[PDB]
Design an enzyme around this catalytic site. Structure first.
Site, PDB file in Angstrom:
ATOM      1  N   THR A  37      32.038  36.742  38.595  1.00 46.69           N
ATOM      2  CA  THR A  37      31.756  35.643  37.692  1.00 46.69           C
ATOM      3  C   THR A  37      31.622  36.200  36.288  1.00 46.69           C
ATOM      4  OG1 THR A  37      29.322  35.687  37.828  1.00 46.69           O
ATOM      5  CG2 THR A  37      30.518  34.540  39.572  1.00 46.69           C
ATOM      6  N   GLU A  88      28.086  30.862  33.751  1.00 44.65           N
ATOM      7  CA  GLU A  88      28.950  31.893  34.306  1.00 44.65           C
ATOM      8  C   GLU A  88      30.120  31.221  35.028  1.00 44.65           C
ATOM      9  OE1 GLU A  88      25.853  33.982  36.396  1.00 44.65           O
ATOM     10  OE2 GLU A  88      26.276  32.860  38.248  1.00 44.65           O
TER      11      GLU A  88
HETATM   12  N1  LIG Z   1      38.603  35.466  38.892  1.00 46.60           N
HETATM   13  C1  LIG Z   1      37.659  35.947  38.079  1.00 46.60           C
HETATM   14  N2  LIG Z   1      36.686  35.115  37.598  1.00 46.60           N
HETATM   15  C2  LIG Z   1      35.688  35.553  36.763  1.00 46.60           C
HETATM   16  N3  LIG Z   1      35.631  36.856  36.372  1.00 46.60           N
HETATM   17  C3  LIG Z   1      36.585  37.728  36.821  1.00 46.60           C
HETATM   18  C4  LIG Z   1      37.616  37.293  37.673  1.00 46.60           C
HETATM   19  N4  LIG Z   1      38.362  38.390  37.919  1.00 46.60           N
HETATM   20  C5  LIG Z   1      37.872  39.386  37.302  1.00 46.60           C
HETATM   21  N5  LIG Z   1      36.801  39.079  36.619  1.00 46.60           N
HETATM   22  C6  LIG Z   1      35.993  40.001  35.821  1.00 46.60           C
HETATM   23  O1  LIG Z   1      34.790  40.191  36.571  1.00 46.60           O
HETATM   24  C7  LIG Z   1      33.710  40.396  35.660  1.00 46.60           C
HETATM   25  C8  LIG Z   1      32.314  40.157  36.299  1.00 46.60           C
HETATM   26  O2  LIG Z   1      32.084  41.087  37.378  1.00 46.60           O
HETATM   27  P1  LIG Z   1      31.351  42.503  37.149  1.00 46.60           P
HETATM   28  O3  LIG Z   1      32.299  43.452  36.513  1.00 46.60           O
HETATM   29  O4  LIG Z   1      30.974  43.063  38.476  1.00 46.60           O
HETATM   30  O5  LIG Z   1      30.152  42.274  36.071  1.00 46.60           O
HETATM   31  P2  LIG Z   1      28.814  41.642  36.714  1.00 46.60           P
HETATM   32  O6  LIG Z   1      28.027  42.831  37.458  1.00 46.60           O
HETATM   33  O7  LIG Z   1      27.980  41.097  35.598  1.00 46.60           O
HETATM   34  O8  LIG Z   1      29.080  40.540  37.684  1.00 46.60           O
HETATM   35  C9  LIG Z   1      34.037  39.426  34.514  1.00 46.60           C
HETATM   36  O9  LIG Z   1      33.342  39.752  33.303  1.00 46.60           O
HETATM   37  C10 LIG Z   1      35.556  39.498  34.426  1.00 46.60           C
HETATM   38  O10 LIG Z   1      35.944  40.403  33.366  1.00 46.60           O
END
Ligand SMILES: Nc1ncnc2c1ncn2[C@@H]1O[C@H](COP(=O)(O)OP(=O)(O)O)[C@@H](O)[C@H]1O
Length: 154
Positions: A37, A88
């Site tokens: 997200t 989010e």
């Molecule tokens: N389908 C998707 N929807 C939303 N975010 C996505 C998607 N695919 C990839 N992302 C990436 O995933 C990130 C969030 O996951 P993550 O890197 O693990 O950070 P967090 O630990 O805050 O969740 C987003 O900021 C985005 O850049």
């Protein structure tokens, strides 16, 4: 829980259009939990969602010039007493690289449900999957799908 929500045709206050930059969250590796997200910069949603119901919404969103159906959770920041809105977004069925610091444009088309008291990871994952299935079913309707070509996305 129903497999579809909202009226046959988009109705006020939808569509709600806005844009915000994708920034990091607090450390919840959703991406690895199979449910990534994107956190929207707080400065973009404070006044706009302040009086909107907390919960899960659905609509379309664009990042890196591609449009995807999506779900969005709207809640309050737990790190501050001063009510701070947080939003989010999960882009549905998207394949590609991350997009931190990128501007996402969002079009909200309807409300799915209010926020449930956190009942664990497994349950959270289940609720998100159902939310996705309901979002896709809900946007299968013409009045909704047409927003995938909205000028805001042009
Ligand atoms: N389908 C998707 N929807 C939303 N975010 C996505 C998607 N695919 C990839 N992302 C990436 O995933 C990130 C969030 O996951 P993550 O890197 O693990 O950070 P967090 O630990 O805050 O969740 C987003 O900021 C985005 O850049």
């Amino acid at each position: 829980r129903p497999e579809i929500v909202g009226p046959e045709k988009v109705q006020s206050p939808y569509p709600i259009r806005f844009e915000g930059k994708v920034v990091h969250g607090f450390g919840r590796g959703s991406k690895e939990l199979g449910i990534p997200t994107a956190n929207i910069s707080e400065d973009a949603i404070q006044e706009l969602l302040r009086y909107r119901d907390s919960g899960v919404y659905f609509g379309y969103a664009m990042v890196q010039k591609r449009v995807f159906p999506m779900v969005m959770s709207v809640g309050w920041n737990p790190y501050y007493k001063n009510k701070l809105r947080s939003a989010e977004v999960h882009l549905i069925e998207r394949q590609g690289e991350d997009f931190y610091e990128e501007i996402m444009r969002v079009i909200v088309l309807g409300y799915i449900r209010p926020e449930l008291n956190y009942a664990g990871l497994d349950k959270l994952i289940e609720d998100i999957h159902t939310d996705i299935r309901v979002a896709l079913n809900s946007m299968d309707r013409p009045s909704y799908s047409s927003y995938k070509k909205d000028p805001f996305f042009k």
